[PDB]
């Protein structure tokens, strides 16, 4: 009815201990999403196309020409950490649990209050909002997904990480087909490379609508949507991270000359030279066997072209990375390649007093010590000599193709048979929960933005929309656009996340790492004095664990 | 048809700044950037800065940084240049814009628009 | 930042000669280089674009090379509505810098 509330608001992430090792995570989590009519009823197929940027030569990699169809509907989505998990949420996962895998989710939509704005104006510019007790609000679940799958963590639009805040939906679009050739170049290339956007191929040509494919349910002002409970099935995430390269893996060789007296440069020594060690060499006619040429089992990690960008009948792209390496090697201003970097507003951790157009950034730099740094790699002859001579290695120094600036190692691919490397960690808040995998055949081993992937199906993406309140001077022969009354309508959310974690053991002598809370960041935690709070990112994989 | 058009010589005290323009015409605004050049009678010629009307991106060189502020005005084809400070710069300020290659070598400049800073 | 020198600030030339216009880039720049033509009191006008390539309606007395540090610009047979003051400049880094400017002058 009109004045009977049909459901709770419920924000609590509870922990049930079941039997042994094992706890279940049930995240609780509800919103209150502010969603105003469309500017437009009707799907449009708008062409992004900037000819200023990418048509200068030298700047190929700021090319952002699309085609797309621009929907009435928008979208509730919840994939990303921070919807669920308070900071001091994260704290009690990332440090006590071992591994963690995702077991249902549910959503629903309650207390739907939908309002027309009218100006009374004499000579005010004063607004009128009052209820409208029959306007109704659409909702479609695609439980079958049948519309493109568009995981919005990865624009970063999604519902806000704070409960107390209201948030919106966001204005739902997908990709349409389109064909273009970009011509690489540099500053000083002579003539002109091909920038042409050809247009669209009719075979891939794909016009989705909600109103086709998806069963609407109009919610009036007492009306509750539930879903049903989508049950996953993906694998556990590790929540411990692997320090082993592929030059800690075995039996280290036998010290017999052990330090005397306890110091800072007082080194074991390896008794026997070089060339008179016993092991297993993979190097066929050398004798020596060092701790970088012994034989190990398989190879951890793998070298990838950086900074490569791939072409296809759509324009360039760059090629995705999976690696890590935290602070070795790593200086401050240029950590690695291949781990991500996420940009988000105040509605998502971004300090919710700051007035700018700016966003604020991270780069997520992973604990997981399975990357590569390309400064120490080097190729050289087969016939292995004392010192090398510069005609027999390939440093990442000596120019490849003429480009003092390209060595090798932009171009070195070693991915192989013996290649082994770790799934991706969660990113709080902003990294998504649980991807789709590929309708293709030969599926990825991996997904660069998600640590569950949803093999069979996924979970249905919710839209939401106001249906049209017209005026009474209306008709459907005009070419002019249609009239409407102003209305906008604020529902409540709510989803239920389940989660199954184990709890982490103690294995070695001495503390692991634990995410804390200290003196230089005590104040991330806590609002400031006009209630402007932010969410900081915080690691996944504290804990090490050993690769072998 | 390209064309663009600086405003006339500006007389300014050596206190404030005065704002520069350059209206565009014969071709769409938002394709190509609006490049500032400055050209002393004794340093030669040096860039200022470009600004796209795509958005309002800008770049500058280091020492022209909170000297000059360049803005644009879509849907009228114009182009503005502050020149905060104005202390000893009397020069001619132009106004070029790239051309049909995509090299960064102004093939369309403005007529020019001399600044003459004194006391 | 890349400093741009031009060999002279004066080169005097006879109606009907061939003269050789040298810009020297600090940096190695790999054609990226433009030169323009000032008429004092006027705006440069284009005419070399990535060292070779001439602007569509520049005429075919000028003629550019280089590649590297070092460049050079040719009119083939000066005439009175070539001595102007010559520039150079650098479309390889931002920011983009000018070269000193070359006055064609008289054989006095």
């Known amino acids: 009815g009109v004045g009977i509330s049909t459901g709770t608001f419920n924000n609590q992430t509870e922990f049930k201990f079941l039997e042994n090792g094992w706890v279940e995570i049930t995240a609780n989590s509800s919103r209150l999403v502010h969603l105003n009519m469309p500017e437009s009823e009707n799907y449009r197929r708008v062409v992004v196309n900037n000819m200023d940027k990418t048509a200068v030569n030298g700047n190929m990699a700021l090319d952002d020409i699309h085609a797309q169809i621009v929907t009435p509907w928008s979208l509730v989505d919840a994939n990303a950490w921070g919807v669920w998990f308070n900071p001091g949420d994260w704290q009690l996962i990332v440090n006590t649990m071992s591994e963690l895998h995702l077991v249902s989710f549910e959503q629903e939509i309650f207390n739907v209050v939908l309002k027309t704005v009218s100006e009374s104006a004499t000579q005010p510019p004063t607004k009128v909002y009052n209820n409208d007790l029959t306007a109704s609000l659409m909702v479609a679940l695609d439980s079958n997904n049948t519309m493109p799958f568009t995981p919005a963590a990865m624009r970063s639009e999604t519902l806000g990480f704070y409960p107390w805040k209201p948030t919106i939906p966001t204005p739902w679009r997908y990709y349409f087909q389109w064909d273009r050739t970009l011509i690489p170049s540099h500053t000083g290339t002579s003539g002109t490379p091909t920038n042409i956007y050809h247009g669209t191929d009719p075979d891939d040509v794909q016009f989705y609508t909600i109103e086709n494919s998806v069963p609407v349910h109009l919610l009036r002002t007492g009306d509750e949507f539930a879903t049903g409970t989508f049950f996953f099935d993906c694998k556990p995430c590790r929540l411990t991270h692997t320090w082993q390269t592929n030059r800690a893996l075995g039996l280290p060789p036998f010290l017999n000359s052990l330090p005397q007296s306890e110091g800072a440069t007082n080194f074991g020594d390896i008794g026997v030279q070089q060339d008179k060690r016993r092991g297993v060499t993979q190097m066929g006619n050398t004798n020596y066997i060092t701790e970088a040429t012994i034989m190990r089992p398989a190879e951890v990690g793998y070298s990838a072209p950086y900074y490569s960008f791939e072409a296809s009948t759509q324009g360039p792209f760059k090629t995705p990375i999976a690696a890590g390496r935290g602070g070795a090697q790593t200086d401050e201003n240029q950590a690695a390649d291949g781990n991500p970097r996420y940009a988000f507003g105040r509605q998502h951790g971004q300090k919710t007093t700051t007035t700018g157009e700016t966003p604020e950034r991270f780069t997520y730099i992973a604990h997981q010590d399975t990357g590569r740094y390309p400064e120490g790699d080097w190729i050289q002859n087969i016939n292995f000599n004392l010192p090398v001579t510069n005609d027999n290695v390939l440093l990442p120094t000596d120019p490849i193709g003429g480009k003092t600036g390209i060595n090798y190692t932009n171009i070195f691919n070693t991915y192989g048979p013996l290649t082994a490397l770790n799934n991706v960690p969660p990113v709080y808040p902003n990294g998504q929960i649980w991807d789709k995998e590929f309708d293709t055949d030969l599926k990825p081993r991996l997904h660069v933005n998600a640590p569950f992937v949803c093999q069979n199906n996924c979970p249905g993406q919710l839209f939401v929309k106001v249906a049209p309140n017209l005026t009474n001077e209306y008709d459907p022969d005009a070419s002019a656009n249609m009239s409407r009354i102003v209305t906008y309508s604020d529902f409540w959310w709510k989803g239920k996340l389940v989660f199954k974690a184990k709890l982490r053991a103690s294995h070695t002598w001495n503390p692991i790492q634990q995410m804390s809370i200290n003196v230089d960041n005590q104040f991330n935690y806590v609002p400031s004095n006009i209630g402007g709070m932010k969410i900081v990112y915080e690691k996944s994989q504290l804990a090490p664990r050993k690769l072998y | 048809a390209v064309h663009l058009q600086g405003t006339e010589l500006v007389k300014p005290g050596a206190s404030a700044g005065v704002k520069l323009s350059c209206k565009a015409s014969?071709?769409?605004?938002?394709?190509?950037?609006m490049n500032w050049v400055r050209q002393r009678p004794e340093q030669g010629l040096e860039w200022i800065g470009w600004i796209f009307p795509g958005d309002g991106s800008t770049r500058y060189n280091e020492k022209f940084k909170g000297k000059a502020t360049l803005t644009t005005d879509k849907s009228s084809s114009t182009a503005y240049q502050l020149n905060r400070l104005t202390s000893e710069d009397s020069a001619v300020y132009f106004c070029?814009?790239?051309?049909?290659?995509?090299?960064?070598?102004?093939?369309?400049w403005g007529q020019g628009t001399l600044v003459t800073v004194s006391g | 930042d890349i400093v741009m020198t031009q060999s002279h600030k004066f080169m005097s030339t006879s109606v009907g000669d061939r003269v050789s216009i040298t810009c020297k880039a600090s940096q190695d720049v790999n054609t990226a280089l433009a030169w323009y033509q000032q008429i004092p009191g006027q705006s440069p006008k284009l005419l070399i674009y990535?060292?070779?390539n001439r602007y569509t309606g520049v005429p075919d007395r000028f003629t550019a090379s280089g590649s590297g540090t070092d460049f050079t610009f040719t009119i083939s047979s000066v005439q009175a509505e070539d001595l102007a003051l010559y520039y150079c400049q650098q479309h390889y880094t931002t920011p983009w810098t000018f070269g000193g400017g070359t006055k064609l002058e008289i054989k006095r």
């Open positions: 070029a814009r790239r051309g049909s290659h995509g090299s960064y070598s102004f093939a369309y």
């Open positions: 014969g071709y769409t605004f938002t394709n190509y950037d």
């Open positions: 990535s060292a070779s």
